[PDB]
């Protein structure tokens, strides 16, 4: 089509360029809400764990897809295996607040528990990278970024799932590197 190009205008051309009738597109499985609605595993875990996002493995789906956007916003569906009483508090909470337990706590059901803990951080929308010095020189995310802090007597596993999430300002995704070949050549099911 020979667009100007160096203006970086988002030009695209189908099959209709050379007598090709374009077919329909269904782009639901790539919606940013349906790709974030699914659970993910947070590792590692320990008593008094900040349920702070971007603590997930980098190469996981939710992990990378969230590190694909600078700014995100989402309500968490937390799922904890635990062994005693599990207490949860919002981002602006003194460490001592977890003990009393009227601030929301789930007793030990026979299987793992499940909880909806809403978006509590005071900032407008969170961030995956914060450029600039810490509050009063490292890309070290501020403590107000984490949604909440859970403490149970001991935590075995922890799963997180972002509901009604929308992502802003996309970022690079950094696919896996392959060398000395032309296809990645992984074993297929």
């Amino acid at each position: 089509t020979t667009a100007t190009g160096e203006s970086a205008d988002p030009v695209t051309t189908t099959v209709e360029n050379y007598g090709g009738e374009t077919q329909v597109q269904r782009r639901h499985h790539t919606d940013v809400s349906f790709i974030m609605d699914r659970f993910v595993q947070i590792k590692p875990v320990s008593p008094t764990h900040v349920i702070d996002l971007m603590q997930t493995h980098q190469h996981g789906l939710v992990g990378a897809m969230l590190r694909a956007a600078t700014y995100y916003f989402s309500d968490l569906e937390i799922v904890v295996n635990h062994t005693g009483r599990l207490t949860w508090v919002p981002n602006g909470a003194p460490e001592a607040a977890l003990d009393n337990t009227s601030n929301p706590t789930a007793y030990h059901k026979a299987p793992f528990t499940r909880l909806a803990l809403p978006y509590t951080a005071p900032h407008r929308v969170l961030a995956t990278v914060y450029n600039g010095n810490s509050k009063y020189l490292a890309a070290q995310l501020p403590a107000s970024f984490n949604y909440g802090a859970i403490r149970a007597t001991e935590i075995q596993e922890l799963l997180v799932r972002m509901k009604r999430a929308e992502l802003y300002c996309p970022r690079p995704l950094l696919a896996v590197k392959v060398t000395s070949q032309d296809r990645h050549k992984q074993k297929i099911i």
Partner: peptide, 10 residues
């Protein structure tokens, strides 16, 4: 499964 336990703020 996964939920049904009593929650104080529930």
């Amino acid at each position: 499964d996964g939920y049904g336990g009593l929650v104080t703020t529930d």
